[PDB]
Every structure is written in C-alpha cells, then in structure tokens.
RNA sequence: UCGAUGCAACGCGAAGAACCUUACCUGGUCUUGACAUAUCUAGAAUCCUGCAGAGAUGCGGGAGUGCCUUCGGGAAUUAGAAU
RNA sequence: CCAGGGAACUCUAAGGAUACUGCCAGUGACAAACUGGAGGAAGGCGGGGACGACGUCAAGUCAUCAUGGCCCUUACGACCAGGGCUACACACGUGCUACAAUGGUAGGUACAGAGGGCAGCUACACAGCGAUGUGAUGCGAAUCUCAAAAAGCCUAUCGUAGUCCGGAUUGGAGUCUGCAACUCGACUCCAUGAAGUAGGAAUCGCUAGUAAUCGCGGAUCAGAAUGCCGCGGUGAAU
C-alpha cells in the first residue's frame, strides 16, 4: 500500500499498546458487579473519552512486507501475494504444496 | 441496538454542550458533527444542527424524539 | 365460533384456529390454552360456552386485532409525521431495515414496473 | 460412451422380498438419495394391492403388471442425408424394464390419491387390468410405432 | 473365537465369531435394536445365510465410525474375514458372492472452483 | 520421577531420528524405556490465490503438518538422567520435560 | 504464465527448506517476519560477494544462519574482521546473539543464482544479451552439468517490444520430481527497463 | 473509490466497508512533511496532567537525568535550520 | 483400545510388502497389443490430487510488489471528524429459501468425519421463553471443549388448503461485539404473514460413492456468510 498508510497503522498501534494496561484494568472495573453503580458508569465514561485509535478495533492487521490490507494470514503474517513467493522458494518452514 | 446494562450512549463533547445550554436556556443552534449520540429528555425543546455529510441541518427537538439517534433526522442521500 | 369479534374455523384445532385472530400467533395461542386449561388438540367445534367464554376473557389481555391495527398504524404514523429516517422510508414505500435496494426490494416496492 | 461398454453395476435385492426387480423399482421412486423413504412407498403400495386383491405373493403380480406395461417397439430418430426418418426399432430388454418402471412412477406421481403409497397402489391396480396413464403411454409409443411401419432401414 | 476386521467407507467393524445358537450382538445391543434399517439388517446377515448356516455361530460385533449403512457393510466384510478363519472351502463361495473384496469407494474430495467433487458452477 | 519427553516438529523424518537416539540413550544407560508413540498430527491447510488480481479459481493448496511424539522413562536412573541434559538437541524439534 | 516454481514443487521429494525452526502459531509470525527481514538486509549489505543459498535455522534462542557464497575471503575478511561486524549487526535486529557460518561453493557455475546474477550483472554493463546468454550456457556445460536452460525476458537490446529469448542445452526435465534442478529468477535494471533472468540447472536425477 | 468485460468479467481482486480498512466526498488542517540519510543546537527516552476544540491539533505545569567511555564524546531520542 | 491389568484388536503415524499383462486360454505380422479366466484387498491408468510442452490471445495485473518513461511537489503529498463504497424507475450474472403429504409440527431413539480452541473453547450450577448473563471447572490439548450431527427410525397429528406450506416485509421488546449498531451489524422473543401451487423462448451440471440430498467445520474475523475452501451421512438413473 501507500507509505503513509503503513505508517498510519504504526501510530494507530502505538496507542493500542500505550493504553493496553489501562483498558484491561478499566474493563474489569466497569464489569465488576461489586463495584458501585456510580463507580462503573464513571469508569465507562472514561473509556469513551480515551483517544479513538487506542482501541484494538481500529487495527487492521496487514502484510509486513508489502502492506496489503487483504489476503492476510495470521499464522504467517504475510499477505497472500508474498506468502506464495516465499513458500515456493522454500523460505517458509514446514509449508509445502498439499494434495490429498 | 444497544445493551441496556451499558446505559444510553451520549458523546462526551455533546453532553457538556447541552448542559451549558440549559443554564442560559439559549435557542441558538448548537453545531455538532456527532450524530451517533442518543436523544435525552434534557435536550427537549432546544435546537441543534446535525451534520448531514455536507451541511448542518437544523433539528428542533420535541418530546417524541427522545430515544433516537441524532442521525435519524439528518438524511445523507437524495 | 366467533372470538374477539371475528369468526374462526370451527373444525380446526383450538391452537391452530386461534392463530386466525389478528394479533395472536402460535405461542400466544398455546399460552391462552394453558391459562384456561383446554388441550390444544381439542377442536373448536367441541367447545362448551363456559370454556369458549374463558378463552374470550383471556384474549382480552393480549392486544386484539382492533386495538393493534391502530397501534401499528399509530406507530408507523408517528414516524411519518416525525420525518425521521424510518419515517421517510415508510412514506416512500422503501425498505426500512437497511436492506438492499439495488437488487431485491420487490416485497416493499410492489410488482416490478416496466421502464420505457 | 464413445469407445467402450462399461459394465453395469450390481444391485442388491430388496430386503423384504429378495427380488432385484422390486429393488430396482425402489431406485426409480427414490429421490435425494433417500432409500428408506422410497421403500415404505413401494412396500406400502404393494401391501395395499396385496391386501385388497388377496394375493399372498406380490412379486409375481408385479411381474405381470410390468410385462403388461413394457413396450416392444420404440420409434428411434434416424438421419439419411438430412432427412429425418422416425424408424421404429425393437427395444433391448434392459431398456424395456427401465421404460416400464419409469412410466409407472411418473404416472403415479400425478394421481389424485391421498398418499404416494396409495397413489402407486392405484396405478399398479389400474395397470394390472390394462388402464391408466402407464398403459396409455405404452399405447402412445406403439401408436407411433405403427404410425410409420414403413421405414425398415 | 475367530476374529475378522471389517472395513467400509469410514466405519471399522470388529467381529468375534464363535460357534453357538445364532445370536448377534452389536455394540452390546441386539442387531434388530441397533439397526432400524431392514437393508442394514439384511446386509449384516447376508454372508451367514449365503452358505446355509445362519443359526450356527454366535456373533459379537463392535462397530465404530462411519454411518448406518457403512457400518452394515463393515460388519459384512468383518463377518467374511471371520468365516474364512474356520474353513478355507467357504472362501470360493464368499468371493463368488463378492463379500471378500473391501470396497475402496470413498467420498471424493471437493475441488477448488467446483461446488462439489464434480459439480460445476453453471455458466451462460 | 517418571519423566516424559514430548517432541513436536514440522518435518516427520526429523523426529523419527530425534526420538530414536532419545529412546536409545535412555536405554543404553541401564534403564527401561517404552517406544515413541505417535500422536495425531495437526494438518493445517491454506488456500492462497496465485494470480495477483483476478480469477479466484487459480489458487494453491499449502499444508503444514505438525507431528508429535513422546516417550516414557518408567524407571529412571542417575546414569540415565545425566545423559539427558547433555543431549542438547535443537534447530527443528522442540523438547518438553515433565520432571516427575 | 503457467509453470510452477521448480523449487517449491520439489520441497518434500528431493529438496529441503532453507528454514528449520518450530514456532508456536502466536510466535510463528514474528519469527517469519524477522526471518524475512534478515534475507532482505543480507541480500543488500552482502551484494558484492556472490551468495546463492542462505539457510536460516534458529535453535532455542540462537540462530545458525548458513550462507553459501563463492567468495568467502571477502565476506570473512582479514582474520574474520568483516564477519564479526556483521555478527553484532544481525543480532541487533534479532534476538540473542546469533552465530553466522559460511559454506564453500566448490563449483560456482552449477548454482542457478550465481549464474543468473552474472547474466544480470552483464546486462547491467551494456552487454548484448545474445552473448551474455550464450556464454553462461557454455560455462555451465563445461563446468559439469546435464542441462541448462536460461531465459531472458524484457526489452532485450533496448527495443520497444519486449520478447522472451531462451537457450536450452541438455535435459532439464522440469516434470520429473526427482530431478535436482536449481532455479533462480533475478532481474537486470537496465536504462530501458527491467530484464528478467531465469536460469535452470539440471544436475542429475 | 478503482480494477476485472465472449467462452477465459459479473459470490471476480475482496480469506469478510459501522469507525479503521478507504483509495471517494464535505469540511477542518500540515508543508523536508507520517516515513530514510546528509547536519548542527538542548535534553535519557519516558510517564502523569490542565484547559480549548468534532478531532487533527494549540497553549501551559510537575517527576526522572540514561548506559559504555569519561571530558571529543557513541548505538535511540523529542521540538527546527536549510538545501 | 478393551479379546481374555492386558500389549490381543481398533486407532494413531513412521518404515516397508503387494500389482508386474507376472500366470492361463485365445485372437494378432512368429509383433506391439487386444479379449476373456484364475489367484489376490486391489487387474490391466485400481480411485482422486499435484505436476500445465513450444506457443496463442499486444489476454489480466503499473492497485500486492518491483520497474523504464511521463506527470504533482503549501499538492495529485499528509492528518482528522462526519458521510460514502449499503442509493434505486430498472436489466443482467451467480446463488439461497420455497411453492409442500417422499411433507410441516410435537414427543422419544440412534450412527460420523474433519477441523478449531490463551487474538480462546468451555464441563457444571443457577437466572432467563430465548439470544445470552453470573459464578466456577478442565484444557495449549488423542487429556478438557467446541458439540448436539442432521437426513434416519418409532408414535400422534395435519388430509390438499395459499393450508399446522412458505417465511419476505413490517410493528414492539431485548442480548452481545465494539469509543460508537441512525445512515449501516449479527442474533433472540412476540405479533404480522408477501409473492410463490413447479415456472415461455432459451439454457446448465453430472458417468459412481458421482448426481441429488443432509448436516458439521475452517480462513478472513472485535462483531458481521446464503460466498469460498473442506469434512463426512444417505445415495441414484442412464
């Protein structure tokens, strides 16, 4: 993809890790039954006041090499285009052509 | 629509804006781009202008519009 | 038998016949029979006046065809004069639940009309 | 096909009568790969006529009706220099039974009886004496076979 | 206590043949109770009656995998494998009946671009 | 003290030899060892489109098997243990220890 | 384009992956992404030397990268002065210190990548493609081989209409799985466009 | 938004558009710039904050002073100064 | 796994054996081959897949990537919010669900495979009509789980009706995911109950575990399959 779009994902993922611990502690606080009713809504209000990119929902995992937003594989982390190239050269361990 | 346990959603930058309008009881349009917010009973009677994508269409809040999103009344397509 | 102001088939089973009441479906029919205590398999024809009355009294709890047609009309009317998104879709006879309008909306737009 | 003659498959006989003719007829009634559903249709139909006509063994009765439906002469399509001659030819025995088994099922599927087992029972009874669409279909083929009776190429 | 291993499309059947009255027990339950299919019942009991000895041997079958008619074929194959143990003169008759051959038929795999093993996405 | 070794690789001919010396080095030290039982292998298949733009019917089928083996030292000895940390095997196969 | 990669179709029958590490599915991606990053860097920083096969097997923690070049003297340098500065650099972008060893290429003419790189270099230096293609065929056959196929695709000769020219000498039976064929597809960034260079080296079944 | 256009385009790229993805539009913004090397001025980076705004951003206050070499200082680092 | 703790069997997954027109009878140029027969699990290419010659279509891809040339550099580069890619007089291409009785509904009662699970699956208990909610447990898995397979079988019922078919649309009330479900999510419940009674000219797939039919998984994925890629069950006609 474009160079800006790759870098935009980096700064979109920088916030996710920066508020990673805050969300986890906040998430239990708003879901805690023993927490007071006014305690939990105030905390949930803060969750909606955090920076927008901080959530792990705006993350679109992307190919490491080319930055292709489509055809992504979690096991390999590469798009479909570059995974085929590396598999067929033999650079991906274990993976081979299948036939049954 | 939305879980009732999580409460009615209202934007942070809109809840304060309507709260400040209650004190003065002003009738001037309130310019907002957040049409995802729910309509509360505290904002009945005041006038605010929701983004339609191009401009800010003015909407006069009535009693029978509490419980809807602000975007209900800001058509986007023609 | 005549129940809730409209006649219903008498030869059919009680649970099936009660569905002919506009505003009463299969499970509402089942809930009605349980309160009175009549087996659903019993036909409407073999219903005594005492238990036919009991069904009529129980039907008053759930909204019948008369009131519900208004309320549905009022609910739809409430949107039309309101001017909301669902309001403009109802008046224009287009789907209101975010359904595909390019390809398939012929149950909401009526029969396909030829274009010159 | 175009080169060889593939061998025909072996069909196991029906479990209630041990005949490969009824088991093949069950294959002609079955749809969607539902063998058991077709079996009760055939068994119910055969039981209905057997219980009505007072016959102990219905496999021979089904042979009698099947032989009364099977055509002997069929009208093939032939071409001689662009001209289409509807030559009537004999029917190979494997095709005779297939045609008869086909017509019975297709004629019984358009009956007016309540159940399909009852619909098939009517056609089996009707075709036994020599009436019904199945008999009518066989006559129609024979009528066309007699209609030409002039191309012996 | 002759043993035979029966196999069909996905069901493997183990049979323990032994001289007795003729009772058949499949998975600790009677054959009629286990198999509601008359076809499956006949297929299971076919080799025994083929050579005129239905009520001669007691069977203890334990089936696994496959389906309701694949298990019947597996039991038939296993019963063949067990009958050939006591006597080698029955093997000609069972082979002529076609019960000694293990059916290699299997569900053909779905192919890419195809809708099934062979069905194609119709074009126009 | 019944230790159990667990082996997991992608290459199947790499674990057969890897387990072979483990069952040999643990049986040549005056100890009894049961052979490596093969456990069901995980076969992950993938459908990678070959073309960069069009014709979704052109794809490759890749697979990556994950074979697993394990052995049991039913009775261990001090001369069987001391032979086991010095058997430093890596680069292709992961070795797990129960230690008990 | 209708020919499968001859290395990937042989990956299990008569070949070996140039990667030998097991990682968990969570950890598999970051190893591979790290693994690919090594290849791109090492292919540019070590471009002067002629490197063909780089095997990257990482044991628990460490990583035993095994490059196979034809000029070890310039990769290693004086008493390994150049290899050591690469040691501290590869570790910086990887985990714990990873050792790098160099394998020797006895015949730097049977490797497809080495032959392809030479043809790619010659096309860069304004050499007629016909002579560059023919010579590499001659060298490979005279160096001991059973087949070479070299194919050049692009604007050969700086023409406007691209064309494919290929010279085969020997057997190179691509459809035989037990063939031991070395394949390489490199490029030549000329002044008139990229020229693709594909080399097949059949070296006995 | 764009591409795919007879078989061999049309559940095709897309193995999955609420935001993001997004490439299009309305508006609000930035100009060596989100990103790489050439550089010199201060500082460990980094963390927690206030207000104003739809947000991008803008203006302000507190804690910390790295590490190897040590008075040239160096792997990284925040805000420009210009080609 | 379970025949009698066992090391039998099934299973699991590595290494091998077998199959070679090898044997027989015939035809055939004293041939290659062909036709039948025995043995064997398998017979002549045993079934399926991968592998796609020289070239063709200046076929597709400059939007995976790279790249020659051309063009823009306070902008055709860059950031953000909202909209939009989801519009609808319409036509076309792929499908899915149906039009029912070989069926719908309500009770019982069976038989799989393959794959996933810490970026999670959830035993069990309780609350709930339900989606799901709280507590809590086992499991990086042949251990715990997804998960019950459905079609099937037995009983009752409906008795040919636009219906106890069909499930679009719409009204009301909710659960999850997520900063956020109006544009524009998926499910759950109640109510409504649309066309549709087998489809013109024309046209397509399939030769065997195939077609047809029935369910179950996975990738992508916070949530969002009637698509895609697979898995097995029943199982033809010619």
Distance (Å) from CA D9 to C1' I208? 9
- Any F CB within 8 A of E113 CB: yes
Interface with chain D: mutation pick from E32, E38, E41, E103, highest number of D CBs within 10 Å: E38
- Any F CB within 8 A of E121 CB: no
Give the phi and the psi of residue F42 in degrees, each rounded to 5. Answer: -85, 125
The answer to whether the Cβ–Cβ distance between F90 and G20 falls below 8 Å is: no
Distance (Å) from CA A100 to C1' I238? 30
Rounded Cα distance between G133 and G117, Å, is 12
Q: Is E35 exposed, middle or buried (0-12, 13-18, 19+ CB in 10 A)?
A: buried
**Closest amino acid to nucleotide I102 (CA–C1'):** D37
Task: Label each residue of A43-83 as H, E or C.
Answer: HHHHHCCCCHHHCCCCCCCCCCCCCCCCCECCCCCCEHHHH
Contacts of A29 (CB under 8 A, 6+ apart): A35, A39, A40, A43
Which chain A residues contact residue F45 at CB under 8 A?
Answer: 98
Considering all nucleic acid strands, name the nucleotide whose C1' atom is nearest to the C-alpha of residue F58: H12
Rounded Cα distance between C109 and B27, Å, is 41
Give the Cα-Cα-Cα angle G49, G55, G60 (nearest 5 degrees): 130
- What is the separation of C-alpha F36 from the centre of its chain, rounded to a whole number of angstroms? 9
- Any G CB within 8 A of A51 CB: no
**What kind and span of H or E run contains C100?**
none
- Any G CB within 8 A of A25 CB: no
Rounded Cα distance between D13 and E39, Å, is 9
Residue A93: strand, helix, or coil: coil
Rounded Cα distance between F78 and D10, Å, is 67
Q: Are G160 and G144 in contact (CB under 8 A)?
A: no
Q: Are G35 and G56 in contact (CB under 8 A)?
A: yes
Q: Which of E53, E45, E44, E41 is nearest to E89 (CA)?
A: E53
Residues 10-39 of B with CB under 7 A from strand H: 12-13, 17, 31-34
Residue F42: strand, helix, or coil: strand
Is the C-beta atom of E25 closer than 7 angstroms to strand I?
Answer: no
Q: Which of D104, D118, D19, D113 is nearest to D65 (CA)?
A: D104
Distance (Å) from CA G175 to C1' I32? 27
The experimental technique behind this entry is cryo-EM
Q: Is C110 exposed, middle or buried (0-12, 13-18, 19+ CB in 10 A)?
A: exposed
Contacts of B53 (CB under 8 A, 6+ apart): B76
Question: What does DSSP assign to residue G157?
Answer: G
Distance (Å) from CA G41 to C1' H27? 44
Q: Is G202 exposed, middle or buried (0-12, 13-18, 19+ CB in 10 A)?
A: buried
Residue F84: strand, helix, or coil: helix
Burial annotation B15-39 (CB, 10 A radius, 16+ → b, else e): eebbeebeeeeeeeebebebbebbb
Is the C-beta atom of A12 closer than 7 angstroms to strand H?
Answer: yes
The answer to whether the Cβ–Cβ distance between B72 and C88 falls below 8 Å is: no
Reading the block at residue G54, the tokens are: 């780089």
Which residue of A lies nearest to G15 if distances are taken between CA atoms? A90
Residues 13-42 of C with CB under 7 A from strand I: 13, 16, 19, 21-29, 41
Reading the block at residue A88, the tokens are: 């067929």
Q: Are E34 and E66 in contact (CB under 8 A)?
A: no
Distance (Å) from CA D6 to C1' I210? 15
Which residue of E lies nearest to F49 if distances are taken between CA atoms? E112
Q: How many CB atoms within 10 Å of residue B14?
A: 21
> β-pairing, E2-7 with D88-90?
unpaired
């Amino acid at each position: 993809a474009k160079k800006s779009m790759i870098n935009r994902e980096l700064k979109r993922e920088k916030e996710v890790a920066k508020y990673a611990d805050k969300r986890t502690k906040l998430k239990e606080t708003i879901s805690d039954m023993n927490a007071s009713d006014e305690v939990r809504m105030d905390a949930m209000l803060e969750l909606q006041a955090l920076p927008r990119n901080s959530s792990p929902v705006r993350l679109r995992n992307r190919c490491a090499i080319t930055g292709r937003p489509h055809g992504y594989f979690r096991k390999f982390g590469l798009s479909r285009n570059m995974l085929r190239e590396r598999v067929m050269q033999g650079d991906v361990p274990g993976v081979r052509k299948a036939s049954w | 629509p939305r879980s009732l346990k999580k409460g009615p959603f209202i934007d942070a930058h809109l809840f304060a804006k309507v709260e400040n309008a209650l004190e003065t009881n002003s009738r001037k349009p309130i310019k907002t781009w957040s049409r995802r917010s729910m309509i509360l009973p505290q904002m009945v009677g005041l006038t605010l202008s929701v983004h339609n994508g191009r401009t800010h269409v003015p909407v006069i809040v009535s009693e029978q519009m509490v419980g809807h999103k602000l975007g209900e009344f800001a058509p986007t397509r023609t | 038998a005549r129940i809730a102001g409209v006649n219903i088939p008498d030869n059919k089973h009680a649970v099936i016949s009660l569905t002919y009441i506009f505003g009463v479906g299969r499970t509402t029919a089942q809930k009605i029979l349980e309160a009175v205590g009549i087996a659903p398999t019993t036909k409407v024809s073999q219903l005594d006046d005492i238990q036919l009355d009991a069904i009529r009294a129980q039907v008053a709890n759930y909204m019948t065809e008369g009131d519900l047609r208004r309320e549905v009309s009022m609910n739809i009317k409430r949107l039309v004069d309101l001017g909301c998104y669902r309001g403009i879709r109802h008046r224009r006879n287009l789907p209101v639940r975010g359904q595909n309008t390019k390809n398939n909306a012929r149950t909401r737009k009526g029969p396909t009309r030829p274009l010159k | 096909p175009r080169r060889r003659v593939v061998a025909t498959r072996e069909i196991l006989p029906d479990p209630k009568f041990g005949s490969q003719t009824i088991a093949k007829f069950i294959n002609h009634v079955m749809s969607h790969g539902k063998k058991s559903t077709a079996e009760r249709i055939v068994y119910g139909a055969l039981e209905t006529v057997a219980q009505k006509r007072n016959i102990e063994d219905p496999v021979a009765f089904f042979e009698d009706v099947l032989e009364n439906v099977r055509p002997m002469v069929e009208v093939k399509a032939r071409r001689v220099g662009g001209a289409t001659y509807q030559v009537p030819m004999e029917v190979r025995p494997s095709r005779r039974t297939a045609l008869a088994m086909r017509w019975l099922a297709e004629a019984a599927a358009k009956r007016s009886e309540k159940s399909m087992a009852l619909r098939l029972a009517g056609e089996l009874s009707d075709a036994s004496e020599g009436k019904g669409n199945a008999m009518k279909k066989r006559d129609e083929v024979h009528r066309m076979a007699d209609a030409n009776k002039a191309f012996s190429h | 206590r002759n043993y035979g291993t029966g196999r069909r499309k996905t069901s493997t059947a183990r049979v323990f043949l032994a001289k007795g009255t003729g009772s058949i027990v499949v998975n600790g339950k009677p054959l009629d109770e286990y198999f509601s299919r008359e076809t499956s019942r006949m297929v299971v009991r076919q080799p025994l009656e083929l050579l005129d000895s239905p009520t001669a041997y007691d069977l203890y079958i334990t089936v696994k995998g496959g389906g309701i008619s694949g298990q019947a074929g597996a039991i038939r194959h296993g019963i063949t494998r067990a009958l050939i143990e006591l006597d080698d003169t029955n093997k000609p008759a069972l082979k002529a009946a076609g019960f000694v051959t293990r059916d290699s038929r299997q569900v053909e795999r779905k192919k890419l671009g195809l809708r099934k093993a062979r069905k194609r996405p119709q074009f126009s | 003290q019944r230790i159990r070794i667990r082996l997991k690789s992608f290459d199947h001919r790499l674990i057969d030899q890897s387990a072979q010396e483990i069952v040999d080095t643990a049986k040549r030290t005056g100890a009894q060892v049961c052979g490596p039982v093969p456990l069901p292998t995980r076969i992950e298949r993938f459908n990678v489109l070959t073309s960069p733009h069009v014709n979704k019917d052109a794809r490759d089928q890749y697979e990556i098997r994950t074979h697993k083996r394990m052995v049991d030292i039913v009775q261990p000895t001090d001369k069987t243990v001391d032979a086991l940390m010095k058997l430093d095997l890596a680069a292709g196969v992961d070795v797990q220890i129960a230690l008990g | 384009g209708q020919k499968v990669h001859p290395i990937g179709i042989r990956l299990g029958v008569v070949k070996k992956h140039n990667a030998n590490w097991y990682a968990s599915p969570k950890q598999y991606s970051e190893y591979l992404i790290n693994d690919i990053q090594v290849r791109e860097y090492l292919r540019k920083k070590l471009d002067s030397a002629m490197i063909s096969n780089i095997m990257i097997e990482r044991p628990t923690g460490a990583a035993k990268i095994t490059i196979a070049t034809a000029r070890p003297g310039i990769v290693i340098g004086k008493k390994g002065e150049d290899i050591e500065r690469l040691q501290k650099e590869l570790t910086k972008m990887m985990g714990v210190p990873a050792q790098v060893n160099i394998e020797e290429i006895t015949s730097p003419d049977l490797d497809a990548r080495l032959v392809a790189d030479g043809i790619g270099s010659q096309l860069e230096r304004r050499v007629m493609f016909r002579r560059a293609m023919k010579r590499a065929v001659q060298n490979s056959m005279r160096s001991g081989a059973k087949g070479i196929k070299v194919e050049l695709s692009g604007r050969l000769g700086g023409a406007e209409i691209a064309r494919t020219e290929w010279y085969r000498e020997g057997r190179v039976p691509l459809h035989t799985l037990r063939a031991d064929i070395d394949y390489a597809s490199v490029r030549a960034e000329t002044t008139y466009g990229t020229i693709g260079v594909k080399v097949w080296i059949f070296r006995g079944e």
